[PDB]
């Protein structure tokens, strides 16, 4: 007995939503089963298409009875503890989704082909076209409201930035295949409607068996190329409208399936992405309603694609938008304050240096939203080896240096940048990660601070004497020579660490 | 007497904005009233369309006199207290919107059909085409500036994420119906302009009654199929341009309304979504201006749809965008700090565990924006039963435990995660909701903490002694074995609760 | 002498950017000047179009010499104080934009028509077509880089939410007019290229004067309808491609300008919004390059519209998006915490009540970003009359009640909502704006609090005694009966006001 | 030896990604090499196109062997210090990208033209068409997975707001050129497939050499214009479908390259931006698959453009959106509080004055994110000369005035705005930058404060006496006469500066 967030179901019920897109990608294959033999002017059956659609539907419908038996041993919880007991798992399923799952999985086209049509009354070709049209209609509803609750089951738990656009592009291909096989079947039905109407006014006499094919009967009603003209059209006799391209190309006579599939799929793709622009309909109402439905469905898909894409694109540009709004803010604040050009280009230098190092990421906000031992292991990797180069800090344990790694903040310094000047109070104690720093004094000798060296060691002796609250006056003037990365130790954060050291 | 936010008006004035879209969805039905009988070459009247458009307009125009009487008893307020007094409710309405509401509701097409046209001078068919063209023009303006203030009344108070797109898709259908009935009427007028011009140069002699279709008169000017060719076109004689499809399909002769409606609605839908691409106009100026107007209106609608959709789409992805930006921020911060792979995959584990639990929701910010008794009832449901398993906390009342439920913060812990180690100061007191926790000590024996158990009970005895400010040293090392949900009690938040307990 | 933010220039240099769109909306009118007389097979001049384009260009080019003299008395500032002195205003202008402003304003088409063409060598009709084609080419560059710095002058200072879309829709109309008059002129040039090439192989003898119209000559080369077929096309002789529609419609022969303008503007609008779909080009390279340029320009113009529209749409939905995200955050936090349905629907009631009152606006953040005297005048309008109903607060001056109006915070309460219960400590002092409140006590009698009444008067006597820090215990249980708006006075904010009262 | 962020590589490996777009913009030039001579009905070779494509490919393939030798001396780092040592630089490159970089740079079309085809068996024209079709196929894969890691190398480091749209517009031009040369080559192959099939059923007898075009042999199979009709098409014999336009225009026979390039590039641009709308395919499967691929690629390309443009557009409106939301928040907060019109238009005046000065930029947040010496140099430019007009502040050094420039905050005041009134406590000390201020007193005389003057000098003597904590009472009422910019000095920030002055 399992629960819906258990690892077996949560990896197996993603294959079920996949096999329900495979299932609706094979239901229009039964529309390619009726055929027209244009020599004898008869409606026929593509027998090998009839087998191909029946076993492709079966092999995806013995994959959803496996969903039915995996909902008899699923997990209800409450109105914190799951229910592992049957006869209430198998009573809410039988009150919520069991019949829709069993009306969607019944082999209704495969059983009407094997059982019902060879024992029906009339022509086998007309019965096959009429049963497979309506059974695929009447099973079209539970095969789509079985995917509504199974998607509500996975909105309570794939995703990438582009997955909404890739599923959108697949929805073009599925709808183009559905609309084109509908167009195939409606083209065959409009030609047989022409044949029936021409036979009910039989100036030339018509025999009604011979509209339906039968290999025992050779030859059919030969006058039907006059009353139902296709290769040269006469819309006074019959306007075929948007179905004339299917009857002129001979796709309704071919028994070659990739020939038949690709011509009709491309009709669906051409007219969905055109929003029905080039559909020259006749005055027939249901042909117009088909073209209206193609126009609306393509109108709804294209707008989704443009959106699913501008979403992919904008997902990938936030920190970069946020930098552009800050660079344009550093502009027109300078030239509203009328800053001199030596001040403005130092501002542009720091904001570009902060951008190429951090990329908009606030490191302290990123680390504070981590757990206290994971944040400790990061800051002991970054900051602890820098603190071991101060000749006093080895005297502390792994309880006070862990207070110091917690209080080290990363700072950035461009070139020409002054860290401190002689005479200023010392706020920080730096621990240099990168860059070279020239320090001078007039009290002369010029020292150099590289990676691993530390500035501000006047401040430790101030924040150890248990002393004045005014900061010690800098005896050195420290200036950066290259881009400097460092870790800053503030005065009061060092003053806290002084109280736990005696 | 009512006020505009009162419950009667605020549910009844949403039916008024609905009946004003039904009203503009039936005004182009009067354009389907003129008819052409192509045998006799006469302009006629569809009499049953003339009744259908008159009673569909009446039954939506006795639904807006109900708006007029519901503005005589509405509520003015001031330049906090509403005005319930008449003769100033019925004086600002008569200075703001009363005449536009009464110019929009006058039964001008129904009264010109029943009264004015049977007592006019000329032909009844030409008068019906000319009056219904211009009255639907001249009443088109107050039937659209009556929806401008009624929409300003409901911008001061439906909405869903997709309602802007569903109203956009309905605006296609309304504009396609308007543009297609305009195209129907302009096609009839271009054929009668051809008939008038052919009769003013009568090489073959023409009688001007017979352009207008009387059932007493049989037969008309038979030479008009020569001078106004339609079924085979000659643009030297007359170029019908974009109206030739209406005259060749026979939609201007049919009295079958769903035949006539669907052919013309589809023309409007095909050419709006094409932005007027396939309109092969003639050199006639107002035909070009009609095609320019179709092109602009379809540009405007399409751009709105694409926007209304991307809004729906983005309305559904904010917290999920915010997770992807944080994930792209965690990457390239790791590999800029060059973190080891044991540290990086622990970061990715916590940020994915925090995502699948919280989905970006900050619980403390969500609870703090709630009222103080509603926030109290939530935290007494979540946290109070967990506090009753500490063997001291039953000694408090429902005034001090309510201070403790207010200070419990939810924390998350992945697997392998250390809560505390032996030797560290104890900051928190946990109250485990989920997961198993192995605690050890070397002072050996290994205990286990499950759901309902609590960690950090060294800290209560510290924050009861009225003691040192340094936290007690942990005697245990607690480590998570599975994903742990818990509630954390900080040291100073427990130190507050100690002062109200004696 | 003026400065660029002075009120004269800043209202007058918005008419200058308007007259520079009027100027480029009249430059293609010189392309409608050449004409073809198809009877005599001659290229001619539309003389009244030649006057109309010359005075429409003049009346917008004596509107930009006014820009030249308003840049001789403009204001330079520095590399805070403007420069009001000439000879340096009129030396940077002569080094930055003076020649581009004078190359754009020279009456080069009007002066080649009046002076240069009547004193040139060759045919007056071919010289008019060739000069007006190239002078409008060679003055097309400075009439567009004169709008680049003048737009940089107004990005340093109209805007609405829809102005980017309305300017976008105007950019369709301007580009359609430019592209269609280009198509008009290129159609005339392709027919004369046919006439010249047919005359250089004169199996039928051709006289080269007679391709150019001269009203003295009557009759021209009559064989040119054979070698340059238009009304029935033969692409073996000459393929006119995308220019055949202009030569067949007779728009290149008409001297009726609104006939000629609207047919060519509609060609530009039809093919820009089609992105060049229906352009059936010939194999001519520059015809293809024209069609490639129409395709790219429409591709760029459409993408901007879709963006400009969705900016309009999203601008108007920020707080409403922010409410929908908060509503989707309240859901799945409830049903992740598994809250009972009495708790969940109270949460949905408060968040919908807060939405319909505030519409996402934080009032305290809105008021704090206002100046201190403007924020004082608002809070003395809202809160001071409510404070005058407490019978102690009239004893204070307009220095201490102004401290109380500064500390009053707006609160909201739904129905059934408990303000305080008997036994709870009293945190707030309410001042009711709206709604009715039933207060009870068991110490029984039930009082009622309406608009103007105040709750929490136990707390003033606590925060006047100079007393315990624990809050006074509520003797009443106050519960809301309707939606309550009130102003809350916190305990410590009342404790501050107590120190300035003795 | 260099590293990937070193200045030589980081400027030279942007030319490498440029020469890899030039490289894929010249691979379809080999598809323009086969030619059809329609008189003799033979497939031939364009010899000068064969040289032009070979030297344009060579001159961009001796530009990527320079990338191969610049990856033998690049910089590995670790699993902070780079590796400058060979034999491990040249062992990971030989395990990651060396063979894909050498399979992409091999001169396979140039060497099959010069070496392999003159020593092959069969016809030289059929071998040239078949080798150049498949070698450009088989080298198409490593010439595109060589740009995947080189782009991953520059996502770890151009950009502008419009660069994603300009690269998108270039991706139209590259794909249109690729698709149109594919269409050129597939048009030639469909005509030769027609010639082969007509020769395998030789009612009229066909000689198979003469399908391949040798200058020694004059004349070919002349019956092929009957069985493969092009100029008048017969789809019963052969349906050329979407390739008929190439065979009818004679672009497959022309040896004029800009004629041939522009006709085929425009076919690609017309059908990509149409998403394959106007492609009238035949029933041939791979022609349909080509048209399906054009439809999908244009569907993806267009959606990206619309997104890349709306990103540009929105990049430019983030602060201006933020002002419009704040303006829509100020409205309906006023008229929910029912503020009087003298209060509302003062609110609209300040929020518009703050907008035209600051443009949404928070100056204190902008300055605080700058380094402490750069922020000091800005505030000494803005604020120090204003502080030197107070007659006491020259007595301080450059250590205490630097504390005062750090604490000066910019304030804005509209006209009619009261700074302080007589009787109010003085919170601020202003330092006027702009505007005139009328100050009065009743203790009368009216003074004036201009730029450089300072208000609030009652407060310095309060915050120097080492005194009461209550602020001094204003003896003046100061009111603005024009828009005032000033710097504010708060009372406690002046009280800090008092402690360091004795
Ligand atoms: Ca289109
Ligand atoms: Ca089209
Ligand atoms: Ca489109």
UniProtKB/Swiss-Prot annotation, chains A, B, C, D:
UniProt-annotated binding residues for a nucleoside 3',5'-cyclic phosphate: 392-502
Q: Which keywords are on file for this protein?
A: Calmodulin-binding, cAMP, cAMP-binding, Cell membrane, cGMP, cGMP-binding, Ion channel, Ion transport, Ligand-gated ion channel, Membrane, Nucleotide-binding, Transmembrane, Transmembrane helix, Transport
Please give the knockout or disruption phenotype noted for this protein.
Answer: Plants exhibit an improved tolerance to Pb(2+).
Extracellular compartment segments: 36-49, 119-130, 187-285
Q: Which GO terms describe its molecular function?
A: calmodulin binding; cAMP binding; cGMP binding; monoatomic ion channel activity
Q: What is its main location?
A: membrane
Membrane topology reported for the UniProt record: Multi-pass membrane protein
Localization per Swiss-Prot or TrEMBL: Cell membrane
Question: So which tissues is this one expressed in?
Answer: Expressed in the whole plant but only weakly in roots.
Question: Which segments does the topology annotation call Cytoplasmic?
Answer: 71-97, 152-165, 307-502
**Which parts pass through the membrane?**
15-35, 50-70, 98-118, 131-151, 166-186, 286-306
Naming one, the record's GO cellular component terms include: plasma membrane
What interactions and quaternary structure are annotated?
A: Homotetramer or heterotetramer (Potential). Binds calmodulin-2/3/5 with a higher affinity than calmodulin-1/4.
Functional summary from the UniProt entry: Acts as a cyclic nucleotide-gated ion channel. Can be activated by cyclic AMP which leads to an opening of the cation channel. May be responsible for cAMP-induced calcium entry in cells and thus should be involved in the calcium signal transduction. Could transport K(+), Na(+) and Pb(2+).
Domain notes for this protein = The binding of calmodulin to the C-terminus might interfere with cyclic nucleotide binding and thus channel activation.
Please report which protein family the annotation says this sequence is part of. Answer: Belongs to the cyclic nucleotide-gated cation channel (TC 1.A.1.5) family.
Q: Know the name of this protein?
A: Cyclic nucleotide-gated ion channel 1
Lineage, highest ranks first: Eukaryota, Viridiplantae, Streptophyta, Embryophyta, Tracheophyta
The part of the entire sequence present here spans: 84 to 603 of 716
